[PDB]
Amino acid sequence: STGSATTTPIDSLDDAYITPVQIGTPAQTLNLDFDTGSSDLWVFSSETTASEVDGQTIYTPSKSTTAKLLSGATWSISYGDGSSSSGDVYTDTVSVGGLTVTGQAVESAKKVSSSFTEDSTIDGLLGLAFSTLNTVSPTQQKTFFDNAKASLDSPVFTADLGYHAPGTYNFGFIDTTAYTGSITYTAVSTKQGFWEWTSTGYAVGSGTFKSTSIDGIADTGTTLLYLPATVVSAYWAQVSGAKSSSSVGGYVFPCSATLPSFTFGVGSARIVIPGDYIDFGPISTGSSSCFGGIQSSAGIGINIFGDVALKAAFVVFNGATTPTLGFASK
Ligand SMILES: NCc1ccc(C(F)(F)F)cc1
């Protein structure tokens, strides 16, 4: 079987993408952030403290005939940006774009950090990294992709994120009309639980391609592109007036500048990120300083190929016994 769902940017900057997901019987539809950088399916619920909920749609397990409390199980998770959430665990039926999994662990948030509360467009997260990262204790739980794998036609899902436009998450098949040319596959390391791979180098604008190995993760749940300081300095040096700001927390540039493209390597292939994708707009309303979409990973400890990079490509997450990542131009 297969599934297919439209994903839509939450705002005008593509800060995140939400995808409708049906949970429970009868269906309760929540808009979840599909995150290949984590492995928990957690939702705002009727159990979330009332003061930490501001306009989100909530999951009510008491109204689902198929919901079952997973007795004794708890979860607690903290993201790389400092966000966090925690609560208890139900099992229920979960469907994405026609693809249904029964007995999926649905982690009901009892507490959520402030950054989730002030984001009324995101009802929760659907983790798509490897199940070794799932935070349910004492019995670790499988992700939606892992539970659906056996019944999928092909153990793959694809991310086709749009630039200021809706896109598509497909499960179980590769849409050969969604990309141009060939898909270039590259090996994945699962040792840290991430979709971790090695890029073969980079170029800035029309400059020469620098062959260098850049280890990093493919993370639909991270907005920006986080790369080593040497790479990020070489990019921003080509933008007049760009500088790293301590008060802002990253590279900023004059909103009147035009940004060069950024190219990253996938084996022998090249993926070009148009300069417009790197513009994240004024750092504050009315400001003439704009925030850059390519930032240094030095403070993080891992390089992150976030939405800025992934939306320039058609990306295949191949969850075969030997996992691989496929990239195609589109
Ligand atoms: N999008 C999930 C996520 C967030 C942060 C990280 C970090 F910071 F640990 F790399 C990995 C994955």
mmCIF file with all atom_site columns, C-alpha atoms in Angstrom, residues 1-3 21 34-36 38-41 94-96 99-105 125-132 134 141-159 169-174 188 190 193-195 315-325:
data_model
loop_
_atom_site.group_PDB
_atom_site.id
_atom_site.type_symbol
_atom_site.label_atom_id
_atom_site.label_alt_id
_atom_site.label_comp_id
_atom_site.label_asym_id
_atom_site.label_entity_id
_atom_site.label_seq_id
_atom_site.pdbx_PDB_ins_code
_atom_site.Cartn_x
_atom_site.Cartn_y
_atom_site.Cartn_z
_atom_site.occupancy
_atom_site.B_iso_or_equiv
_atom_site.pdbx_formal_charge
_atom_site.auth_seq_id
_atom_site.auth_comp_id
_atom_site.auth_asym_id
_atom_site.auth_atom_id
_atom_site.pdbx_PDB_model_num
ATOM 1  C CA . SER A 1 1   ? 0.000  0.000  0.000  1.00 0.00 ? 1   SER A CA 1
ATOM 2  C CA . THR A 1 2   ? 0.918  3.686  -0.323 1.00 0.00 ? 2   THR A CA 1
ATOM 3  C CA . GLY A 1 3   ? 0.089  7.075  1.135  1.00 0.00 ? 3   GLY A CA 1
ATOM 4  C CA . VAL A 1 21  ? -2.780 13.483 10.051 1.00 0.00 ? 21  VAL A CA 1
ATOM 5  C CA . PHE A 1 34  ? 6.981  15.902 9.892  1.00 0.00 ? 34  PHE A CA 1
ATOM 6  C CA . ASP A 1 35  ? 10.462 15.734 11.411 1.00 0.00 ? 35  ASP A CA 1
ATOM 7  C CA . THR A 1 36  ? 13.166 13.431 10.007 1.00 0.00 ? 36  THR A CA 1
ATOM 8  C CA . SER A 1 38  ? 13.459 12.975 15.689 1.00 0.00 ? 38  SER A CA 1
ATOM 9  C CA . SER A 1 39  ? 11.544 9.796  16.358 1.00 0.00 ? 39  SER A CA 1
ATOM 10 C CA . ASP A 1 40  ? 8.552  10.675 18.550 1.00 0.00 ? 40  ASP A CA 1
ATOM 11 C CA . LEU A 1 41  ? 4.948  11.184 17.450 1.00 0.00 ? 41  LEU A CA 1
ATOM 12 C CA . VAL A 1 94  ? -3.022 6.845  12.713 1.00 0.00 ? 94  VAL A CA 1
ATOM 13 C CA . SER A 1 95  ? -3.486 7.567  9.005  1.00 0.00 ? 95  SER A CA 1
ATOM 14 C CA . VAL A 1 96  ? -1.427 9.765  6.680  1.00 0.00 ? 96  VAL A CA 1
ATOM 15 C CA . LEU A 1 99  ? -1.927 5.016  4.728  1.00 0.00 ? 99  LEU A CA 1
ATOM 16 C CA . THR A 1 100 ? -3.185 3.560  8.024  1.00 0.00 ? 100 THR A CA 1
ATOM 17 C CA . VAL A 1 101 ? -1.206 2.111  10.949 1.00 0.00 ? 101 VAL A CA 1
ATOM 18 C CA . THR A 1 102 ? -3.009 0.455  13.858 1.00 0.00 ? 102 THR A CA 1
ATOM 19 C CA . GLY A 1 103 ? -1.494 0.464  17.328 1.00 0.00 ? 103 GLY A CA 1
ATOM 20 C CA . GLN A 1 104 ? 0.775  3.456  16.731 1.00 0.00 ? 104 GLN A CA 1
ATOM 21 C CA . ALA A 1 105 ? 2.244  5.039  19.851 1.00 0.00 ? 105 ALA A CA 1
ATOM 22 C CA . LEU A 1 125 ? 5.370  16.391 15.578 1.00 0.00 ? 125 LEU A CA 1
ATOM 23 C CA . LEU A 1 126 ? 5.650  13.174 13.571 1.00 0.00 ? 126 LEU A CA 1
ATOM 24 C CA . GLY A 1 127 ? 9.176  11.834 13.905 1.00 0.00 ? 127 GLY A CA 1
ATOM 25 C CA . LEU A 1 128 ? 10.719 10.046 10.922 1.00 0.00 ? 128 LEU A CA 1
ATOM 26 C CA . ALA A 1 129 ? 14.280 9.375  12.109 1.00 0.00 ? 129 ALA A CA 1
ATOM 27 C CA . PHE A 1 130 ? 15.215 5.868  13.241 1.00 0.00 ? 130 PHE A CA 1
ATOM 28 C CA . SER A 1 131 ? 13.327 4.259  16.111 1.00 0.00 ? 131 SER A CA 1
ATOM 29 C CA . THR A 1 132 ? 16.487 3.989  18.236 1.00 0.00 ? 132 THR A CA 1
ATOM 30 C CA . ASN A 1 134 ? 12.406 7.315  20.431 1.00 0.00 ? 134 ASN A CA 1
ATOM 31 C CA . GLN A 1 141 ? 8.284  2.657  20.580 1.00 0.00 ? 141 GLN A CA 1
ATOM 32 C CA . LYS A 1 142 ? 8.506  2.503  16.791 1.00 0.00 ? 142 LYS A CA 1
ATOM 33 C CA . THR A 1 143 ? 7.939  5.440  14.452 1.00 0.00 ? 143 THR A CA 1
ATOM 34 C CA . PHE A 1 144 ? 5.058  5.682  11.989 1.00 0.00 ? 144 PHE A CA 1
ATOM 35 C CA . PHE A 1 145 ? 7.414  4.809  9.127  1.00 0.00 ? 145 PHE A CA 1
ATOM 36 C CA . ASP A 1 146 ? 8.768  1.751  10.940 1.00 0.00 ? 146 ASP A CA 1
ATOM 37 C CA . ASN A 1 147 ? 5.267  0.461  11.732 1.00 0.00 ? 147 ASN A CA 1
ATOM 38 C CA . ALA A 1 148 ? 4.072  1.011  8.152  1.00 0.00 ? 148 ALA A CA 1
ATOM 39 C CA . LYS A 1 149 ? 7.198  -0.442 6.504  1.00 0.00 ? 149 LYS A CA 1
ATOM 40 C CA . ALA A 1 150 ? 5.965  -4.008 6.077  1.00 0.00 ? 150 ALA A CA 1
ATOM 41 C CA . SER A 1 151 ? 2.745  -3.009 4.305  1.00 0.00 ? 151 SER A CA 1
ATOM 42 C CA . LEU A 1 152 ? 4.356  -0.379 2.070  1.00 0.00 ? 152 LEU A CA 1
ATOM 43 C CA . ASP A 1 153 ? 4.919  -1.311 -1.558 1.00 0.00 ? 153 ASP A CA 1
ATOM 44 C CA . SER A 1 154 ? 8.512  -0.059 -1.160 1.00 0.00 ? 154 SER A CA 1
ATOM 45 C CA . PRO A 1 155 ? 10.089 0.819  2.229  1.00 0.00 ? 155 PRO A CA 1
ATOM 46 C CA . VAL A 1 156 ? 10.600 4.464  1.231  1.00 0.00 ? 156 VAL A CA 1
ATOM 47 C CA . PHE A 1 157 ? 9.152  7.883  1.790  1.00 0.00 ? 157 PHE A CA 1
ATOM 48 C CA . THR A 1 158 ? 9.906  11.022 -0.167 1.00 0.00 ? 158 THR A CA 1
ATOM 49 C CA . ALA A 1 159 ? 9.950  14.693 0.783  1.00 0.00 ? 159 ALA A CA 1
ATOM 50 C CA . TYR A 1 169 ? 5.155  13.665 1.440  1.00 0.00 ? 169 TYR A CA 1
ATOM 51 C CA . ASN A 1 170 ? 4.743  10.276 -0.242 1.00 0.00 ? 170 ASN A CA 1
ATOM 52 C CA . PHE A 1 171 ? 4.976  6.897  1.499  1.00 0.00 ? 171 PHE A CA 1
ATOM 53 C CA . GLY A 1 172 ? 5.703  3.645  -0.313 1.00 0.00 ? 172 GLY A CA 1
ATOM 54 C CA . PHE A 1 173 ? 6.451  4.829  -3.853 1.00 0.00 ? 173 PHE A CA 1
ATOM 55 C CA . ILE A 1 174 ? 8.650  7.198  -5.857 1.00 0.00 ? 174 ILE A CA 1
ATOM 56 C CA . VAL A 1 188 ? 23.445 6.600  5.225  1.00 0.00 ? 188 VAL A CA 1
ATOM 57 C CA . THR A 1 190 ? 22.371 5.096  11.311 1.00 0.00 ? 190 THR A CA 1
ATOM 58 C CA . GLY A 1 193 ? 19.835 7.453  14.895 1.00 0.00 ? 193 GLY A CA 1
ATOM 59 C CA . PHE A 1 194 ? 19.711 10.158 12.200 1.00 0.00 ? 194 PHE A CA 1
ATOM 60 C CA . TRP A 1 195 ? 19.514 10.134 8.417  1.00 0.00 ? 195 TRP A CA 1
ATOM 61 C CA . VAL A 1 315 ? 14.586 13.678 -1.511 1.00 0.00 ? 315 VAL A CA 1
ATOM 62 C CA . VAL A 1 316 ? 14.116 9.913  -1.135 1.00 0.00 ? 316 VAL A CA 1
ATOM 63 C CA . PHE A 1 317 ? 14.398 8.420  2.357  1.00 0.00 ? 317 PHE A CA 1
ATOM 64 C CA . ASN A 1 318 ? 15.101 4.767  1.518  1.00 0.00 ? 318 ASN A CA 1
ATOM 65 C CA . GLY A 1 319 ? 14.493 2.672  4.626  1.00 0.00 ? 319 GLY A CA 1
ATOM 66 C CA . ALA A 1 320 ? 15.651 -0.616 3.133  1.00 0.00 ? 320 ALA A CA 1
ATOM 67 C CA . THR A 1 321 ? 17.810 -2.946 5.222  1.00 0.00 ? 321 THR A CA 1
ATOM 68 C CA . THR A 1 322 ? 20.769 -0.888 4.004  1.00 0.00 ? 322 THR A CA 1
ATOM 69 C CA . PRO A 1 323 ? 19.342 2.662  4.182  1.00 0.00 ? 323 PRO A CA 1
ATOM 70 C CA . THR A 1 324 ? 20.230 5.285  1.568  1.00 0.00 ? 324 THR A CA 1
ATOM 71 C CA . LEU A 1 325 ? 19.314 8.882  0.744  1.00 0.00 ? 325 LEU A CA 1
#
